[PDB]
């Protein structure tokens, strides 16, 4: 079982849509890794297309609360919440594969049939979510918040070099022989 061996070396895979079950599993694994060793690095690999905002906030808070440094590595794609999780790693320890893509855009949501007051409350809530999103993106990046708002207006796709210049990641690792 390769996943068990990976977990034995403090490595966590996130290659599924970010929902409640996956968030709970990730948080439980993070708590176990902290309990077994509170002062050694934890590696998180991201290959997910995105997910719900509440699970994203839960995972982000769990990563921030847990004190050992978290090294985030992007392998395939990191879109929406996956980009935020990738940028939420320890500075200097955020990496991406040479051929990878990072996708950022403003949140999208659906609501059911309802009266105007409920719709207004939902609109206020989603605007609050979006504002929290720009705050989270600006905190862990080297880009002004106004540029963040202008960029995440539509779908923004960045390669490894574009992400490195954009501040989400810190290194592009080519091979193993060439350190």
């Amino acid at each position: 079982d390769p996943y068990a061996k990976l977990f034995e070396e403090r490595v966590i895979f996130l290659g599924v849509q970010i929902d409640d079950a996956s968030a709970n599993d990730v948080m439980a694994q993070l708590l176990c890794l902290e309990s077994m060793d509170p002062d050694r690095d934890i590696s998180v690999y991201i290959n997910s297309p995105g997910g719900s905002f509440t699970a994203l906030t839960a995972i982000y808070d769990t990563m921030q609360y847990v004190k050992p440094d978290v090294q985030t590595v992007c392998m395939g794609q990191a879109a929406a919440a996956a980009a935020v999780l990738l940028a939420a790693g320890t500075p200097g320890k955020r990496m991406a594969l040479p051929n990878a893509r990072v996708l950022i855009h403003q949140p999208y949501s659906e609501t059911g049939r309802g009266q105007v007051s409920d719709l207004e409350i939902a609109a206020n809530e989603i605007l609050r979510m979006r504002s929290q999103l720009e705050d989270m993106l600006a905190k862990h990046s080297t880009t002004p918040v106004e540029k963040i708002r202008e960029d995440i207006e539509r779908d923004k796709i960045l390669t490894a070099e574009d992400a490195l210049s954009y501040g989400l990641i810190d290194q592009v690792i080519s091979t193993r022989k060439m350190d």
Binding site: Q106, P107, Y108, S109, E110, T111, G112, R113, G114, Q115, V116, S117, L119, E120, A122, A123, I126, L127, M129, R130, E153
Partner: protein, 178 residues
């Protein structure tokens, strides 16, 4: 079959019906009937209301068409007149809005849904707020109450029969017979 002929001849006399929920095609047909009847600018048009409401824009088109013609319109509520059906019932000329003794009238705020990105949701939400306040001000103007009183009343659905409807300004009088 029979419905076509009876509706045709009733339209010939003076009569127009709204016995179904308000939507695009029924609004178009009612507007066409009103425009055709407006050719003779002396007689009045009797409109019977029995519907649980409908789309906002179609009701707005019917209301605007009613206000556009100089012919008097006599709205009569029968069976049920709720949501936009009530609004079109009260939109008739003053002193010629009536309801049946066993009729019921319901009022409540509009409803809709939201979909899309945050910017589009915000735009649609502000559009909905503007529409809601527009409906509040028009219903207050046509009923005789104040804007704020109607705003408090139209938070949840409220029911009336003919009597508190007529003393509430929704309707002018009630006939048991012709």
């Amino acid at each position: 079959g029979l419905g076509d002929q009876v509706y045709n001849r009733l339209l010939n006399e003076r009569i127009i019906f709204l016995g179904q929920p308000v939507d695009d095609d029924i609004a178009n047909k009612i507007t066409a009937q009103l425009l055709l009847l407006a050719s003779d600018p002396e007689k009045d048009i009797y409109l019977y209301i029995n519907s649980p409401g409908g789309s906002i824009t179609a009701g707005m088109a019917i209301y605007d068409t009613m206000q556009y013609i100089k012919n008097d319109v006599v709205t009569i509520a029968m069976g049920l007149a709720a949501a936009m059906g009530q609004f079109l019932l009260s939109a008739g000329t003053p002193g010629k809005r009536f309801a049946l003794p066993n009729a019921e009238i319901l009022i409540h705020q509009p409803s809709a849904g939201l979909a899309g990105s945050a910017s589009d949701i915000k735009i649609h939400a502000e559009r909905l707020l503007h529409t809601k306040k527009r409906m509040a001000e028009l219903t207050s103007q046509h009923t005789g109450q104040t804007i704020e009183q109607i705003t408090r009343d139209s938070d949840r659905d409220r029911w009336f029969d003919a009597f508190e409807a007529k003393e509430y300004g929704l309707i002018d009088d009630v006939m048991t017979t012709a």
